Amino acid sequence: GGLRRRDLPADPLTLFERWLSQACEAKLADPTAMVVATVDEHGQPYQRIVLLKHYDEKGMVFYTNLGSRKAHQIENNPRVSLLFPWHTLERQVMVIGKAERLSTLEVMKYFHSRPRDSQIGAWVSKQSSRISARGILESKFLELKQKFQQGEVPLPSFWGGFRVSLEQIEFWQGGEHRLHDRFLYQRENDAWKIDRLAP
């Protein structure tokens, strides 16, 4: 039935929650997978996929290695863009905001709530650095996989997370006659301003 303004919820997260729910129901691979774009010191954008782990009015959260390229880029420029590649369902959601670091209390909590093999793998790689061979990863994994025995596997000091604020949330949905529906929610004065955008 297309996407009409009169049917839009006041809070964009209500629409996002609905769409995310429908993506899970349609069994898309990694429905929480989103492409995060950051920008380096030279004005060059970079992209990579990460998984959305939690979200609310304060923003969308993902975890990563603090020595990674995306982390170094965010430290120099906190402005990021997030895009949910849901084109298989003829949809896209894009979020614009600032990335802020999570506290260790938050990171520890989430970290110890995930499968133990994932807790162990977080220790393995010096994410994004050049390495001379795959073997380096394999050896370290074997070492950690035994040195820990997985007693409770501690939080690496280089593991962290970012919360991206919700400054703008844009929805795209395939439309009849290829006349696609686009709505931009823009945070303005403690409220959301909504505008339809030409496709």
Ligand X SMILES: Cc1cc2nc3c(=O)[nH]c(=O)nc-3n(C[C@H](O)[C@H](O)[C@H](O)COP(=O)(O)O)c2cc1C
Residues recognised as catalytic = 178
| 186 lies in the site for ligand X, by CB under 6 A | no
**What is the C-alpha separation between 93 and 102, in angstroms, rounded?**
23
CA distances from 132 to 38, 53, 109, 158 (A): 26, 32, 34, 21
Q: In the stretch 166-185, what mask flags binding to ligand X with x, by CB under 6 A?
A: ------x-------------
Question: Residue 41 CB, nearest distance to a second copy (Å)?
Answer: 10
127 known member of a binding site: yes
> Applying CB under 6 A, which of residues 3, 59, 66, 70 lies at the interface with ligand X?
70
Assigned token pair, 30: 């990694």
Tell me if 118 is assigned to a ligand binding site. Answer: yes
Q: What does the alpha-carbon distance between residue 70 and residue 44 come to, in Å, rounded to a whole number? A: 12
Query: Between 58 and 87, whose beta carbon lies closer to ligand X?
Result: 87
Q: Tell which one of 2, 4, 14, 46 touches ligand X (CB under 6 A).
A: 46
Instruction: Confirm if 184 and 198 have CB atoms less than 8 A apart.
Output: no
Is residue 87 a contact residue for a second copy (CB under 8 A)? yes
Q: What is the distance between the alpha carbons of residues 83 and 86, in angstroms, rounded to a whole number? A: 9
177 belongs to the binding site for a second copy (CB under 8 A): yes
Answer for which of 80, 102, 107, 166 binds a second copy (CB under 8 A) is 80
Interaction between residue 87 and ligand X (CB under 6 A)? yes
Residue 156 site contact among ligand X, a second copy, none (CB < 5 to 8 Å, cut-off depends on kind): none
Residues 180 and 143: their CA atoms lie apart, in Å, by 53
Is 182 annotated for ligand binding?
A: yes
146, with CB counted inside 10 A (0-12, 13-18, 19+), is exposed
> Any known ligand binding at 50?
yes
Map residue 55 onto helix, strand or coil: strand
66 binds, among ligand X, a second copy, none (CB under 5 to 8 A by kind): none
Q: How far is CA 28 from CA 49, 112, 182, 193, in A?
A: 15, 27, 22, 31
Does 77 help bind ligand X (rule: CB under 6 A)? Answer: no
| Residue 68 lies near ligand X (rule: CB under 6 A) | yes
| Spatial distance between the Cα atoms of 60 and 44, rounded to a whole number of angstroms | 23
| Annotated binding-site positions for substrate | 53, 110, 114, 118, 178-180
